[PDB]
């Protein structure tokens, strides 16, 4: 596995020469499994991960500020799973474009500031601010898991979108969304279509629903406070919500 360091200096990039890693004008492209540690400010770019469905990568955000004037700061085209680690004590900021440009205009992905076609896990005790101006904040077509982090999401559309599922087991999470705070869609795959919150401190301000899930919502051992225009929890399936967990944002 690779263990590479990438340092941004506004309009310069200093990267280890390693297998499968390339740097182009507005792109850092990862094609081999391993760990990739990012730091510094990048004026305009995308971290593109395309390593195959049988391989994993860790992106360590070690004090990075990435803006992308055309698209998503992080786009995972393929992976078994990508873990995004928020380094302790570091401030990370990701800012995407108001309107995405799709080089092939028949594409409509990526459609979130952090977008993945595959499982994504966010972890660590560091800080992350996601400024999502186009559509969703953190999105995946499969499973989103957050196990830690001081995470702030500002999204034009949905805050966290995990088509398969969304799991939050830790972290201090602050979501502002123009649609749903947390949204899940999958109707078919066994034991998907759920939102499972088992820890953390969560604040959701949503114009529509705080949590919009298809088959299940479970909340326990967590502090979830919401202020919404729609429902605190919208779910066609089952609700298993421990008392004293879900309340009003003051």
The nearer residue to Ca ion, 85 or 209, going by C-beta atoms, is 209
Helix (H, G, I), strand (E, B) or coil at 137: strand
**159, 137 in Cβ contact below 8 A?**
yes
In terms of CB distance, is 93 or 214 closer to Ca ion?
Answer: 214
Site string for Ca ion, 39-68 (x = CB under 5 A): ------------------------------
* Cα(33)–Cα(167) distance, integer angstroms: 24
Asked whether the beta carbons of 92 and 130 are under 8 A apart, the reply is: no
**Residue nearest to Ca ion according to CB distances in the complex:** 212
| Binding test (CB under 5 A) with Ca ion, winner from 180, 181, 214, 215 | 180
Q: Which stretch binds Ca ion (CB under 5 A): 94-102, 124-132, 209-217, 218-226?
A: 209-217
- In whole angstroms, the minimum distance from the beta carbon of 119 to Ca ion comes to 4
Residues 6+ apart with CB under 8 A from 130: 94, 113, 114, 137, 138, 151, 152, 153, 154, 155
- The string of DSSP codes covering 101-120 is --SSTT-----EEEEESSEE
Tell me whether residue 212 is annotated as binding: yes
Contact mark string toward Ca ion, 131..150, x via CB under 5 A:
-----------xx-------
- Closest by CA position to 211, among listed 177, 171, 164, 250: 177
Among the residue ranges 56-64, 66-74, 173-181, 189-197, the one whose residues contact Ca ion (CB under 5 A): 173-181
Question: Counting contacts by CB under 5 A, is residue 85 touching Ca ion?
Answer: no
Is residue 215 marked as binding?
A: no
Q: Which is nearer to Ca ion, 93 or 235 (CB)?
A: 235
Record the tokens describing residue 161, joined without a space: 């979108």
CB of residue 116 to Ca ion, shortest distance in Å: 8
Residue count, binding to Ca ion (CB under 5 A): 9
Check: CB of residue 125 under 8 Å from CB of residue 88: yes
Of residues 162, 231, 234, the one with CA closest to residue 193 = 162
Is 121:162 a contact under the CB 8 Å cutoff? no
Residue indicated by tokens 């990370």: 92
- State which residue, 93 or 197, has the beta carbon closest to Ca ion: 197
Task: Mark 99-138 with x for binding to Ca ion (rule: CB under 5 A) and - for no binding.
Answer: ------------------xxx-------------------
Contact indicator for 71, 46 with CB cutoff of 8 Å: yes
Site residues for Ca ion per CB under 5 A = 117-119, 142-143, 180, 208-209, 212
Which amino acids are annotated as binding site for Ca(2+), given as ranges? 117-119, 142-143, 180, 208-209, 212
């Amino acid at each position: 596995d690779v263990n590479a360091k990438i340092v941004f200096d506004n309009d310069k990039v200093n990267a280890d020469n390693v297998d499968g890693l390339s740097v182009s004008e507005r792109e850092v492209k990862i094609t081999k499994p391993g760990m990739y540690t990012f730091s510094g400010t990048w004026n305009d770019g995308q971290i593109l991960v395309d390593i195959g469905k049988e391989f994993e990568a860790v992106l360590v955000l070690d004090g990075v500020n990435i803006t992308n004037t055309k698209s998503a700061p992080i786009y995972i085209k393929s992976a078994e799973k990508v873990k995004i680690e928020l380094a302790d004590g570091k401030d990370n900021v990701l800012t995407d474009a108001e309107f995405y440009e799709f080089e092939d205009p028949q594409d409509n992905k990526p459609n979130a500031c952090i977008y993945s076609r595959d499982d994504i896990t966010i972890k660590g005790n560091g800080n992350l601010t996601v400024n999502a101006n186009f559509n969703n904040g953190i999105g995946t077509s499969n499973d989103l898991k957050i196990t830690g982090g001081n995470i702030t999401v500002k999204a034009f559309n949905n805050g966290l979108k995990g088509n398969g599922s969304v799991t939050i087991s830790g972290g201090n999470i602050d979501i502002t969304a123009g649609a749903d705070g947390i949204k899940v869609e999958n109707t078919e795959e066994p034991h998907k279509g759920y939102v499972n919150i088992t820890g953390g401190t969560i604040k959701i301000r949503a114009k529509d629903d705080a949590i919009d899930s298809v088959r299940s919502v479970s909340i326990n051992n967590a502090d979830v406070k919401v202020s919404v225009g729609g429902k605190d929890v919208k779910c066609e399936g089952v609700l298993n919500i421990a008392e004293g967990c879900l309340g009003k944002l003051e």
